Amino acid sequence: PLTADVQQKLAELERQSGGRLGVALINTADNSQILYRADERFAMCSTSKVMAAAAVLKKSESEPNLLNQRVEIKKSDLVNYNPIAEKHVNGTMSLAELSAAALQYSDNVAMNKLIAHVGGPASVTAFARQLGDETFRLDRTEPTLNTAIPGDPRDTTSPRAMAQTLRNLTLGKALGDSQRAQLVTWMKGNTTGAASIQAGLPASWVVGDKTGSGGYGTTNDIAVIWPKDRAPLILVTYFTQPQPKAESRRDVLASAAKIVTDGL
């Protein structure tokens, strides 16, 4: 935990931001958590790509290769945002190249290839289950899993659920030592995440995160944080709005992060 005014400031942030806000922070220094609306369901949008690349990483631990297995990219595979796979159409990408592209560039084509390889949404969910996450559910594919319609449980998780699941994956032992590091390597290389959580933390703090955008102004970010001379933090910030066509609010997440790391 922290103080009585974090919740007041969070609710202030929420009300003034014109939406709905979910937060879960874990401080590995003392296993204190800050939790705002952290038991309500939020639409993961591209944050779900962490569960995909990680579900594969686990498989690599019982398939001495796998991560180099090449995967065909086809013209019919293409969806709105594919910054990487567009360069290997009629070619191949290994599962590592795909995970890499999905995590660091939010490559929607990549994401679908990850879902495909692990047997579809339900088997990504079953992966979260075996990690002790009984909340995460992935139900659809790129691009539809980002609809983020209010009331709709599909492709949601809770901030508590995902902060803990993320802690296990990136810091704990949900993965092998070398898979864990690899997941950390990919997150730390994310290209897209600067205006979000990271904008709310001391400039000198080191961030590996995955943002997520979607319908209804849904702006999300999930992050592992290594301050110099501290123990690391898990911070999960979900935010969504009422207008179907609202613009993203990356700064609401940064503001969230400044609030829940004040005094650290």
Residue numbers in the entry: 25 to 288
Which sentences from the paper describe this structure?
Cefotaximase-Munich (CTX-M) extended-spectrum beta-lactamases (ESBLs) are commonly associated with Gram-negative, hospital-acquired infections worldwide. CTX-M-15, which belongs to hydrolases (EC 3.5.2.6), cleaves lactam carbon–nitrogen amide bonds rapidly, deactivating β-lactam antibiotics. To understand the mechanism of CTX-M-15 activity, we have determined the crystal structures of CTX-M-15 in complex with two specific classes of beta-lactam compounds, desfuroylceftiofur (DFC) and ampicillin, and an inhibitor, clavulanic acid. The binding pocket of CTX-M-15 for those β-lactams was established by the residues from both the α- and α/β-domains, surrounded by the catalytic residues Ser70, Lys73, Ser130, and Glu166.
The crystal structure of the apo-form CTX-M-15 was obtained at 1.8 Å resolution with three molecules in the symmetric unit with the unit cell parameters of a = 170.6 Å, b = 50.9 Å, c = 106.8 Å, β = 113.23°, in the monoclinic space group of C2. The structure of CTX-M-15 was comprised of two domains, α-domain and α/β-domain. The α-domain consisted of nine helices (from α-2 to α-10), and the α/β-domain consisted of three helices (α-1, α-11, and α-12), and four β-strands (β-1, β-5, β-6, and β-7). To identify the conformation of the bound β-lactams/inhibitor and their interactions with neighboring residues in the binding pocket, the complex crystals of β-lactams and β-lactamase inhibitor were established by diffusing the compounds to the apo-form crystal. In addition, the crystal structure of the apo-form CTX-M-15 indicated that there were several water molecules in the binding pocket. Thus, association of compounds would gain entropic contribution by replacing these molecules.
